[PDB]
Amino acid sequence: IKDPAYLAKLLTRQRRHSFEDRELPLFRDSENAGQLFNSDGEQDVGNPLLASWGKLGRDYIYLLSDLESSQELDAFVDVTPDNLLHNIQSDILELENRAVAGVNIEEFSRSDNKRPLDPLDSSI
Amino acid sequence: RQLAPLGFDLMSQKPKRGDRSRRDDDRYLFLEALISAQQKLYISYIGRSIQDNSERFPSVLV
Amino acid sequence: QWEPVLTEWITAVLQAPLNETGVSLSQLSARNKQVEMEFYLPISEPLIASQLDTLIRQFDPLSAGCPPLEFMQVRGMLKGFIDLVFRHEGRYYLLAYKSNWLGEDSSAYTQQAMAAAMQAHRYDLQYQLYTLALHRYLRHRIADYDYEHHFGGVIYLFLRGVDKEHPQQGIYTTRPNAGLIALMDEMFAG
Amino acid sequence: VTIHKSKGLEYPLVWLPFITNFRVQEQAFYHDRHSFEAVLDLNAAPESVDLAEAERLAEDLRLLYVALTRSVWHCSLGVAPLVRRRGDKKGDTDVHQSALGRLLQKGEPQDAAGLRTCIEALCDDDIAWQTAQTGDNQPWQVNDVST
Amino acid sequence: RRGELGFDDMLSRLDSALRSESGEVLAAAIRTRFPVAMIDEFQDTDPQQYRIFRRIWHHQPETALLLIGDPKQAIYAFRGADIFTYMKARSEVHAHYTLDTNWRSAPGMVNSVNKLFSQTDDAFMFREIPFIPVKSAGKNQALRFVFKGETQPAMKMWLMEGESCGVGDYQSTMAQVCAAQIRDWLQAGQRGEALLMNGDDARPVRASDISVLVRSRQEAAQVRDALTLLEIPSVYLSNRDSVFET
Amino acid sequence: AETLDPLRLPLQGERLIEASAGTGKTFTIAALYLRLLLGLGGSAAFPRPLTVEELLVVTFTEAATAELRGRIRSNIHELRIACLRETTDNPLYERLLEEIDDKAQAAQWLLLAERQMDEAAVFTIHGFCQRMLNLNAFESGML
Amino acid sequence: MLRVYHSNRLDVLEALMEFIVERERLDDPFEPEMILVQSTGMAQWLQMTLSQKFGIAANIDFPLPASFIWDMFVRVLPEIPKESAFNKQSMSWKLMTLLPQLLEREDFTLLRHYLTDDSDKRKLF
C-alpha cells in the first residue's frame, strides 16, 4: 500500500464474477484491512512462501491496482485439499498460515492440530 | 542465481517496483513452478558429494 | 552484376497476372494480403496412410501415378506456413512459391512438366492441407460461410518458369472438388 | 587420510605409525624474528639454515598437534629411535630432531634407553606404552550373510 | 596482454589498489560496504591478505575485526601461509580471547594432549605461540573404547624395540604392527568384545572407525599394501591422482 | 590470554580469537553472527544492528564456507523458533533469549535474515577480493 | 476498456479467452489477433490449447512485449526510423568517441585515473 487515502480507494474497488456476475471484496476482512498493512506500507502476509517468494508479484499487483480505468474480473477455481500439493495450493490461494509454531505449551505438546498426510501421497 | 551488481548503477542503489532482478525472478519462478504443478511435484537436488561424501545443503527455497 | 537483370525479372513476374480472370499482384492492397500465415492443425485420430491416400486419390486427379508415401500414425498437431493469402472482389485465394527448378533451362516448363513436378515433389498433400486449414479458418472466423462462394483456388508460382511472352508458364492454378475438404475435416476432427 | 586433509574432521580410532619420521630442510628460506618478513638467503650460511630448520620444526610440531587432536576414543603412536645420520651406532639418536621426541625427551639429546625412560616417565591411566611385536596368525574372517 | 587472471592475481591487484592513494577511499567504500569482518582460519593468511585487512580495518571506528584462528594449526607453509604473519597480527592487536571447552574427544585424550604438550614451557618453540590446557566436555565424560579385557587407554605409544634402525625397515615394521592392531580390532569388534561406550550405550567398531594418519603418498601406499595383505580393504581419501593415468 | 564468552565479546576494534582443535569454532561463528544480527551485548554491543548483506565472513575453503552458511542458516531458524516460542533446549540460546527484552521485532529480524540468507556475504578470500575488484572497478583500475 | 482477469491457473484464462472469442467475433477476416506471450514455448502451448478448443488456430500473431510496443509505435506514429539511433552498440561506439573529449572536465576525474594510466583502447571500449 502507499497511503491510507489510497487504502480506501482500493477498498472501494471490487471484483465481479465473469460468469456468475457476483461482486467479491478484495480483502478477507474489510474492517481489519488497516490492521494488516503496517505503517511503512508492507502487508504481513500469512503465507510465508508467498511473502518470501512473490515480491515481483507484489510489485506487479501493486502496479496493476495503481491503474485507474482497469476492470478486474476474478475467475478462481477452488482446489479441494486432499493431497499434499493441493494442501499447499489451498494454503497459498486462501491466504492462511498453517505453519504451527507452538507459541504455548499446549500447542507444542499436542501434534494432531496440524493437517494429516497420507503415507501413499506421492504428490510432493 | 545471485548476480553481482555492476557497482556504479543507480538502479541498484535506489530500488523501485518495476526493477528487474535475477534473485527475485528466480524466487518467483520457484513459486510459479509450485503453483503450476497440478498432480505430482518431483524436486531433486545434490545432497551428497560424490568425491568425499560431504554433506551438501539444498537451496533456501527448498 | 545480377541486379539490373533481377529487377526487370521481378517486374516481369509482377506484371504477369495469376488468376482465371487475369488479376495481377499489383492490385492487392496491404489489408488484403496476409504473408506467411502460420497454422497449427489439430488431429486426434491416428493418421493412417492407407486410409488417407485412397481418400486423396478418390478426388485428386493428379494422383493417377505417384505411389503412396509411408509415415507413422501421427496424433497431435500439424505445423504449416502459408506463403500468401489474399482477397479480391469478395473471393479468397491462396498463393505459394517454389523456386528450386534446377533441371529446366528452355521453355519446356509447360503444364505437363509442372504437373510432373507436383507429382514428383508430392505437393498435392501440402496444398490439400492448406485448403483444409483455410476452410477451417474461414469457417471459424466468418459466420455463415460457404466453401464454394468464398474460396477461389490455389496458385503455385514457379519463379524460374515465368516468361514475358508465356503467361501460362510459371503459374499453376488448381481448385479442389469441394468434397474432399469436408471429408478431410471429418477425418481430422473425429 | 593425510594430516592436511584431516583438519576439521572427526575419527574414533586413529593410528599414527610414522609420526616419528622427520625430514631436514636444506634450503635457506626463513623469517626474521624482528621484522617478521620472509628472508631468502641464496648463500649457504648456517645461521639461515638453522633459522629455517627452527620454522620447519615448528611446522612439524603443529602437524603433530593437528594429527593428535583428531582422535575421539583412542590414538596410537609409533615411536622408535630413528637416526637420520648415516652413522649406525654413534652413541646418540636423532629423536630430539623430530617433533614427537621434542616433547618426550624435553628437547634434550639422549639415547634409545634414555628415550625409553622418557616414555616410561610420563605413565598415567590415559598414557601407556607397549613394545612392537611382529606377528601374524590369520588375515581376517569374512562373516558373510545370505543375499 | 591476454587479459587473463589468476588466483593470487586477485590478491595482488587488490593489494596494488589499496597501496595507492585513491584506493584508500576505495577502502572507505569497503567501510561503506561491510562495516564488520569475521575472518575464519587466520593461520592460513598470506602477508598480502593481512596487509589488505590492515589497510581496511586497522583503527577506524564503528567497524569491528574478529580474527578467529589457531596458531597451532598453521600447517600450510608449503602453500603460501605463514605463522610469522599471525605473530605480527598478535603483536599488532591488543585483545586476546581463547576457548576453554573441547567438545570432540574423550577426557582421557584431552588429558593426554594436555600432558604431552605441557612438559616444558613454549613447546611450540615460539614465544608468541602459548599453549594452555583445554577443558573436556561434561556431556562426553563417559566415552570409553573397551577391549575384551580392561579398558584401553587413550594414547598408546607403541615403542619399536631396538638400538638404531633405518627408515624403510622402521616403516615396514610399524606398518605391520598397525595392520596387526587393525585386524585384531576388526576381529574383536565382530564378536562383541571391542566396543565404543558412551555411558551405557555401546557401538561395535566397524572398518570405517579406524583411520591411519600418514604424511606422504609413499607411506600411504605402504600402509595400503600392508593392510591388503591381511584381507582388509582400505580407501585413500587424500588420493588426488587422475583417473586418466590408470 | 583470556577466556572467551560468545555473549560478552566486545565488538569494537580488533579482537583475536584462538579456537583450539576440536572446539566449537563453527558454533562460535554462528553465535557471533546472531549477535551481530540482533545487536546484543549491552555496553559491549554493536552501535547499530546490521543486515545479512553487511556481515562479512571470510573462510578459505569453499566447502567450509558452504557448511558455515548452512550452519548459520540452521542457527537463524532455531533462534527464530526459540524466539517465537520463548523457550529453548540450549543454554547459549537460553542466555540469548534472556539478553533481549523485545520478542516480536527480534523474530521479524530473524525472519528477514532467513529470507535474505540467500544473499549472505559469506565468500572465500579470492572470491571476496574478486567481488571487491569487480564492484569498485574504477578506483582499482581493473577490466 | 482495459480488462485484467485474475485467476489461479491458465486453463481458466484459456476458457475465458475462448468465451471472449465465441462471444465477440472479428469483423475483418484478415485482421490478426494479437496474443502477448512470455516466450515461444508459451506461444506454442497457447496454439495447442486453441487448436484443442476451437479446432483451428490460424492467423494468430504472438508478439513479444517489446516487439508489440515497437509495432504500436510504428502503426500509431508515422515517420519513425526502423532502427533506433540509441542502440547499445551504437551508444558504445558513440561513447568511445565522446569519453576522451571529456577527460579534461572536472566531473570525470574518477575516469581520468582509470583511463589515462595505460590504455590500448581496451579499457575505453
PDB file of N, CA and C in Angstrom, chain F residues 32-102:
ATOM      1  N   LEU F  32      28.321 -15.496  16.987  1.00  0.00           N
ATOM      2  CA  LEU F  32      28.692 -14.108  16.731  1.00  0.00           C
ATOM      3  C   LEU F  32      27.901 -13.516  15.568  1.00  0.00           C
ATOM      4  N   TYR F  33      27.488 -14.348  14.607  1.00  0.00           N
ATOM      5  CA  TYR F  33      26.638 -13.875  13.519  1.00  0.00           C
ATOM      6  C   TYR F  33      25.250 -13.508  14.027  1.00  0.00           C
ATOM      7  N   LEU F  34      24.692 -14.326  14.926  1.00  0.00           N
ATOM      8  CA  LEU F  34      23.414 -13.989  15.548  1.00  0.00           C
ATOM      9  C   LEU F  34      23.533 -12.765  16.451  1.00  0.00           C
ATOM     10  N   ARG F  35      24.684 -12.599  17.111  1.00  0.00           N
ATOM     11  CA  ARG F  35      24.927 -11.417  17.936  1.00  0.00           C
ATOM     12  C   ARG F  35      25.023 -10.157  17.082  1.00  0.00           C
ATOM     13  N   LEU F  36      25.649 -10.256  15.908  1.00  0.00           N
ATOM     14  CA  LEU F  36      25.728  -9.115  15.003  1.00  0.00           C
ATOM     15  C   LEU F  36      24.387  -8.820  14.342  1.00  0.00           C
ATOM     16  N   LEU F  37      23.568  -9.849  14.107  1.00  0.00           N
ATOM     17  CA  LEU F  37      22.257  -9.626  13.506  1.00  0.00           C
ATOM     18  C   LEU F  37      21.291  -8.989  14.497  1.00  0.00           C
ATOM     19  N   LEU F  38      21.257  -9.490  15.734  1.00  0.00           N
ATOM     20  CA  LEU F  38      20.313  -8.965  16.713  1.00  0.00           C
ATOM     21  C   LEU F  38      20.838  -7.739  17.448  1.00  0.00           C
ATOM     22  N   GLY F  39      22.149  -7.510  17.439  1.00  0.00           N
ATOM     23  CA  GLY F  39      22.728  -6.379  18.139  1.00  0.00           C
ATOM     24  C   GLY F  39      22.665  -6.521  19.647  1.00  0.00           C
ATOM     25  N   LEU F  40      23.363  -7.517  20.182  1.00  0.00           N
ATOM     26  CA  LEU F  40      23.332  -7.833  21.601  1.00  0.00           C
ATOM     27  C   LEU F  40      24.689  -7.566  22.236  1.00  0.00           C
ATOM     28  N   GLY F  41      24.676  -7.401  23.557  1.00  0.00           N
ATOM     29  CA  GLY F  41      25.899  -7.182  24.304  1.00  0.00           C
ATOM     30  C   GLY F  41      25.803  -6.064  25.320  1.00  0.00           C
ATOM     31  N   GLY F  42      24.823  -5.179  25.153  1.00  0.00           N
ATOM     32  CA  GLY F  42      24.660  -4.056  26.055  1.00  0.00           C
ATOM     33  C   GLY F  42      25.702  -2.978  25.850  1.00  0.00           C
ATOM     34  N   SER F  43      26.616  -2.835  26.814  1.00  0.00           N
ATOM     35  CA  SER F  43      27.685  -1.850  26.680  1.00  0.00           C
ATOM     36  C   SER F  43      28.729  -2.303  25.667  1.00  0.00           C
ATOM     37  N   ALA F  44      28.953  -3.611  25.563  1.00  0.00           N
ATOM     38  CA  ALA F  44      29.891  -4.177  24.606  1.00  0.00           C
ATOM     39  C   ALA F  44      29.227  -4.573  23.293  1.00  0.00           C
ATOM     40  N   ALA F  45      28.070  -3.998  22.980  1.00  0.00           N
ATOM     41  CA  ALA F  45      27.326  -4.337  21.779  1.00  0.00           C
ATOM     42  C   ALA F  45      27.762  -3.473  20.600  1.00  0.00           C
ATOM     43  N   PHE F  46      27.279  -3.843  19.417  1.00  0.00           N
ATOM     44  CA  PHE F  46      27.491  -3.032  18.232  1.00  0.00           C
ATOM     45  C   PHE F  46      26.641  -1.763  18.326  1.00  0.00           C
ATOM     46  N   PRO F  47      27.101  -0.644  17.728  1.00  0.00           N
ATOM     47  CA  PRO F  47      26.315   0.601  17.766  1.00  0.00           C
ATOM     48  C   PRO F  47      24.969   0.517  17.060  1.00  0.00           C
ATOM     49  N   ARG F  48      24.872  -0.309  16.021  1.00  0.00           N
ATOM     50  CA  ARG F  48      23.620  -0.477  15.297  1.00  0.00           C
ATOM     51  C   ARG F  48      23.540  -1.903  14.775  1.00  0.00           C
ATOM     52  N   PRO F  49      22.342  -2.483  14.703  1.00  0.00           N
ATOM     53  CA  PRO F  49      22.211  -3.814  14.103  1.00  0.00           C
ATOM     54  C   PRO F  49      22.373  -3.752  12.592  1.00  0.00           C
ATOM     55  N   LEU F  50      22.942  -4.816  12.038  1.00  0.00           N
ATOM     56  CA  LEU F  50      23.253  -4.886  10.620  1.00  0.00           C
ATOM     57  C   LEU F  50      22.433  -5.985   9.958  1.00  0.00           C
ATOM     58  N   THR F  51      22.371  -5.924   8.631  1.00  0.00           N
ATOM     59  CA  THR F  51      21.614  -6.883   7.846  1.00  0.00           C
ATOM     60  C   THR F  51      22.510  -8.045   7.419  1.00  0.00           C
ATOM     61  N   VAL F  52      21.959  -8.929   6.587  1.00  0.00           N
ATOM     62  CA  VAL F  52      22.714 -10.089   6.121  1.00  0.00           C
ATOM     63  C   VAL F  52      23.738  -9.680   5.071  1.00  0.00           C
ATOM     64  N   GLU F  53      23.436  -8.650   4.285  1.00  0.00           N
ATOM     65  CA  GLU F  53      24.335  -8.165   3.244  1.00  0.00           C
ATOM     66  C   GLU F  53      25.387  -7.191   3.768  1.00  0.00           C
ATOM     67  N   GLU F  54      25.536  -7.069   5.088  1.00  0.00           N
ATOM     68  CA  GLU F  54      26.565  -6.233   5.685  1.00  0.00           C
ATOM     69  C   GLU F  54      27.512  -7.001   6.597  1.00  0.00           C
ATOM     70  N   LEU F  55      27.230  -8.270   6.883  1.00  0.00           N
ATOM     71  CA  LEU F  55      28.110  -9.100   7.696  1.00  0.00           C
ATOM     72  C   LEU F  55      29.026  -9.900   6.779  1.00  0.00           C
ATOM     73  N   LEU F  56      30.333  -9.693   6.919  1.00  0.00           N
ATOM     74  CA  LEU F  56      31.325 -10.331   6.062  1.00  0.00           C
ATOM     75  C   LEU F  56      31.987 -11.480   6.811  1.00  0.00           C
ATOM     76  N   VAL F  57      31.895 -12.682   6.248  1.00  0.00           N
ATOM     77  CA  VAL F  57      32.537 -13.872   6.795  1.00  0.00           C
ATOM     78  C   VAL F  57      33.546 -14.376   5.773  1.00  0.00           C
ATOM     79  N   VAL F  58      34.789 -14.565   6.210  1.00  0.00           N
ATOM     80  CA  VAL F  58      35.887 -14.959   5.334  1.00  0.00           C
ATOM     81  C   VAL F  58      36.448 -16.286   5.822  1.00  0.00           C
ATOM     82  N   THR F  59      36.315 -17.324   4.995  1.00  0.00           N
ATOM     83  CA  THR F  59      36.907 -18.631   5.243  1.00  0.00           C
ATOM     84  C   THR F  59      37.520 -19.132   3.943  1.00  0.00           C
ATOM     85  N   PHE F  60      38.681 -19.786   4.045  1.00  0.00           N
ATOM     86  CA  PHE F  60      39.465 -20.117   2.856  1.00  0.00           C
ATOM     87  C   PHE F  60      38.815 -21.229   2.037  1.00  0.00           C
ATOM     88  N   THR F  61      38.443 -22.328   2.688  1.00  0.00           N
ATOM     89  CA  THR F  61      37.910 -23.483   1.976  1.00  0.00           C
ATOM     90  C   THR F  61      36.460 -23.241   1.571  1.00  0.00           C
ATOM     91  N   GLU F  62      36.139 -23.585   0.319  1.00  0.00           N
ATOM     92  CA  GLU F  62      34.806 -23.333  -0.224  1.00  0.00           C
ATOM     93  C   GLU F  62      33.757 -24.222   0.438  1.00  0.00           C
ATOM     94  N   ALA F  63      34.107 -25.488   0.690  1.00  0.00           N
ATOM     95  CA  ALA F  63      33.197 -26.387   1.394  1.00  0.00           C
ATOM     96  C   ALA F  63      32.999 -25.946   2.838  1.00  0.00           C
ATOM     97  N   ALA F  64      34.026 -25.331   3.434  1.00  0.00           N
ATOM     98  CA  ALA F  64      33.877 -24.762   4.769  1.00  0.00           C
ATOM     99  C   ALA F  64      32.926 -23.572   4.760  1.00  0.00           C
ATOM    100  N   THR F  65      32.959 -22.762   3.693  1.00  0.00           N
ATOM    101  CA  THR F  65      32.020 -21.647   3.581  1.00  0.00           C
ATOM    102  C   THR F  65      30.594 -22.141   3.376  1.00  0.00           C
ATOM    103  N   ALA F  66      30.419 -23.212   2.593  1.00  0.00           N
ATOM    104  CA  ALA F  66      29.083 -23.771   2.392  1.00  0.00           C
ATOM    105  C   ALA F  66      28.537 -24.394   3.676  1.00  0.00           C
ATOM    106  N   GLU F  67      29.390 -25.115   4.414  1.00  0.00           N
ATOM    107  CA  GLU F  67      28.979 -25.707   5.683  1.00  0.00           C
ATOM    108  C   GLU F  67      28.678 -24.636   6.725  1.00  0.00           C
ATOM    109  N   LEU F  68      29.467 -23.557   6.743  1.00  0.00           N
ATOM    110  CA  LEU F  68      29.220 -22.463   7.675  1.00  0.00           C
ATOM    111  C   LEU F  68      27.952 -21.700   7.312  1.00  0.00           C
ATOM    112  N   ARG F  69      27.665 -21.559   6.012  1.00  0.00           N
ATOM    113  CA  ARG F  69      26.422 -20.925   5.583  1.00  0.00           C
ATOM    114  C   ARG F  69      25.210 -21.757   5.985  1.00  0.00           C
ATOM    115  N   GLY F  70      25.294 -23.079   5.805  1.00  0.00           N
ATOM    116  CA  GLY F  70      24.212 -23.951   6.241  1.00  0.00           C
ATOM    117  C   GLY F  70      24.026 -23.963   7.749  1.00  0.00           C
ATOM    118  N   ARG F  71      25.133 -23.918   8.499  1.00  0.00           N
ATOM    119  CA  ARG F  71      25.039 -23.916   9.957  1.00  0.00           C
ATOM    120  C   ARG F  71      24.495 -22.591  10.481  1.00  0.00           C
ATOM    121  N   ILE F  72      24.867 -21.473   9.850  1.00  0.00           N
ATOM    122  CA  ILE F  72      24.332 -20.173  10.248  1.00  0.00           C
ATOM    123  C   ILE F  72      22.850 -20.070   9.888  1.00  0.00           C
ATOM    124  N   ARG F  73      22.449 -20.660   8.755  1.00  0.00           N
ATOM    125  CA  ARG F  73      21.034 -20.720   8.388  1.00  0.00           C
ATOM    126  C   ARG F  73      20.231 -21.552   9.388  1.00  0.00           C
ATOM    127  N   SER F  74      20.789 -22.691   9.814  1.00  0.00           N
ATOM    128  CA  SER F  74      20.124 -23.527  10.809  1.00  0.00           C
ATOM    129  C   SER F  74      20.050 -22.832  12.165  1.00  0.00           C
ATOM    130  N   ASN F  75      21.094 -22.076  12.526  1.00  0.00           N
ATOM    131  CA  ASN F  75      21.079 -21.329  13.781  1.00  0.00           C
ATOM    132  C   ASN F  75      20.069 -20.188  13.741  1.00  0.00           C
ATOM    133  N   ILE F  76      19.922 -19.541  12.580  1.00  0.00           N
ATOM    134  CA  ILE F  76      18.920 -18.488  12.410  1.00  0.00           C
ATOM    135  C   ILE F  76      17.515 -19.064  12.546  1.00  0.00           C
ATOM    136  N   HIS F  77      17.274 -20.230  11.932  1.00  0.00           N
ATOM    137  CA  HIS F  77      15.961 -20.869  12.028  1.00  0.00           C
ATOM    138  C   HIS F  77      15.661 -21.332  13.452  1.00  0.00           C
ATOM    139  N   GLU F  78      16.665 -21.889  14.141  1.00  0.00           N
ATOM    140  CA  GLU F  78      16.463 -22.354  15.511  1.00  0.00           C
ATOM    141  C   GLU F  78      16.251 -21.192  16.475  1.00  0.00           C
ATOM    142  N   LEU F  79      16.976 -20.083  16.287  1.00  0.00           N
ATOM    143  CA  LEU F  79      16.770 -18.924  17.147  1.00  0.00           C
ATOM    144  C   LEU F  79      15.441 -18.238  16.851  1.00  0.00           C
ATOM    145  N   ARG F  80      14.975 -18.284  15.597  1.00  0.00           N
ATOM    146  CA  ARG F  80      13.649 -17.758  15.278  1.00  0.00           C
ATOM    147  C   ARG F  80      12.549 -18.592  15.926  1.00  0.00           C
ATOM    148  N   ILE F  81      12.699 -19.921  15.903  1.00  0.00           N
ATOM    149  CA  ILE F  81      11.736 -20.801  16.565  1.00  0.00           C
ATOM    150  C   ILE F  81      11.758 -20.590  18.079  1.00  0.00           C
ATOM    151  N   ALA F  82      12.955 -20.467  18.664  1.00  0.00           N
ATOM    152  CA  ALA F  82      13.071 -20.258  20.104  1.00  0.00           C
ATOM    153  C   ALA F  82      12.582 -18.877  20.527  1.00  0.00           C
ATOM    154  N   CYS F  83      12.659 -17.884  19.639  1.00  0.00           N
ATOM    155  CA  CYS F  83      12.133 -16.563  19.955  1.00  0.00           C
ATOM    156  C   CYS F  83      10.620 -16.502  19.793  1.00  0.00           C
ATOM    157  N   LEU F  84      10.064 -17.260  18.843  1.00  0.00           N
ATOM    158  CA  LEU F  84       8.612 -17.331  18.722  1.00  0.00           C
ATOM    159  C   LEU F  84       7.992 -18.152  19.846  1.00  0.00           C
ATOM    160  N   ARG F  85       8.729 -19.122  20.389  1.00  0.00           N
ATOM    161  CA  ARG F  85       8.217 -19.971  21.458  1.00  0.00           C
ATOM    162  C   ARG F  85       8.621 -19.507  22.852  1.00  0.00           C
ATOM    163  N   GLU F  86       9.546 -18.544  22.954  1.00  0.00           N
ATOM    164  CA  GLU F  86      10.100 -18.008  24.204  1.00  0.00           C
ATOM    165  C   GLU F  86      10.734 -19.084  25.088  1.00  0.00           C
ATOM    166  N   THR F  87      11.228 -20.165  24.485  1.00  0.00           N
ATOM    167  CA  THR F  87      11.872 -21.250  25.215  1.00  0.00           C
ATOM    168  C   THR F  87      12.783 -22.003  24.256  1.00  0.00           C
ATOM    169  N   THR F  88      13.745 -22.723  24.828  1.00  0.00           N
ATOM    170  CA  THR F  88      14.710 -23.483  24.045  1.00  0.00           C
ATOM    171  C   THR F  88      15.283 -24.594  24.912  1.00  0.00           C
ATOM    172  N   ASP F  89      16.017 -25.499  24.266  1.00  0.00           N
ATOM    173  CA  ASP F  89      16.682 -26.605  24.941  1.00  0.00           C
ATOM    174  C   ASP F  89      18.187 -26.406  25.060  1.00  0.00           C
ATOM    175  N   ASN F  90      18.708 -25.256  24.629  1.00  0.00           N
ATOM    176  CA  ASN F  90      20.131 -24.961  24.631  1.00  0.00           C
ATOM    177  C   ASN F  90      20.439 -23.829  25.606  1.00  0.00           C
ATOM    178  N   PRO F  91      21.510 -23.945  26.399  1.00  0.00           N
ATOM    179  CA  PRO F  91      21.803 -22.887  27.382  1.00  0.00           C
ATOM    180  C   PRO F  91      22.313 -21.596  26.762  1.00  0.00           C
ATOM    181  N   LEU F  92      23.093 -21.673  25.679  1.00  0.00           N
ATOM    182  CA  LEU F  92      23.531 -20.459  24.996  1.00  0.00           C
ATOM    183  C   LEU F  92      22.354 -19.753  24.333  1.00  0.00           C
ATOM    184  N   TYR F  93      21.436 -20.522  23.742  1.00  0.00           N
ATOM    185  CA  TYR F  93      20.201 -19.946  23.220  1.00  0.00           C
ATOM    186  C   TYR F  93      19.316 -19.408  24.339  1.00  0.00           C
ATOM    187  N   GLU F  94      19.376 -20.020  25.526  1.00  0.00           N
ATOM    188  CA  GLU F  94      18.623 -19.514  26.671  1.00  0.00           C
ATOM    189  C   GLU F  94      19.157 -18.161  27.124  1.00  0.00           C
ATOM    190  N   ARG F  95      20.485 -18.014  27.172  1.00  0.00           N
ATOM    191  CA  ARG F  95      21.070 -16.721  27.519  1.00  0.00           C
ATOM    192  C   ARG F  95      20.842 -15.684  26.422  1.00  0.00           C
ATOM    193  N   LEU F  96      20.810 -16.121  25.157  1.00  0.00           N
ATOM    194  CA  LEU F  96      20.480 -15.219  24.057  1.00  0.00           C
ATOM    195  C   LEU F  96      19.043 -14.719  24.158  1.00  0.00           C
ATOM    196  N   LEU F  97      18.114 -15.595  24.549  1.00  0.00           N
ATOM    197  CA  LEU F  97      16.733 -15.168  24.747  1.00  0.00           C
ATOM    198  C   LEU F  97      16.585 -14.299  25.991  1.00  0.00           C
ATOM    199  N   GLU F  98      17.407 -14.536  27.016  1.00  0.00           N
ATOM    200  CA  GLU F  98      17.348 -13.719  28.221  1.00  0.00           C
ATOM    201  C   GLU F  98      17.982 -12.347  28.031  1.00  0.00           C
ATOM    202  N   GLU F  99      18.874 -12.189  27.048  1.00  0.00           N
ATOM    203  CA  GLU F  99      19.515 -10.891  26.857  1.00  0.00           C
ATOM    204  C   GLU F  99      18.584  -9.870  26.209  1.00  0.00           C
ATOM    205  N   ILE F 100      17.633 -10.312  25.390  1.00  0.00           N
ATOM    206  CA  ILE F 100      16.751  -9.399  24.669  1.00  0.00           C
ATOM    207  C   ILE F 100      15.497  -9.149  25.492  1.00  0.00           C
ATOM    208  N   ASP F 101      14.997  -7.912  25.437  1.00  0.00           N
ATOM    209  CA  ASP F 101      13.748  -7.575  26.110  1.00  0.00           C
ATOM    210  C   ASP F 101      12.545  -7.743  25.186  1.00  0.00           C
ATOM    211  N   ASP F 102      12.696  -7.396  23.910  1.00  0.00           N
ATOM    212  CA  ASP F 102      11.615  -7.482  22.937  1.00  0.00           C
ATOM    213  C   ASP F 102      11.695  -8.805  22.185  1.00  0.00           C
TER     214      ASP F 102
END
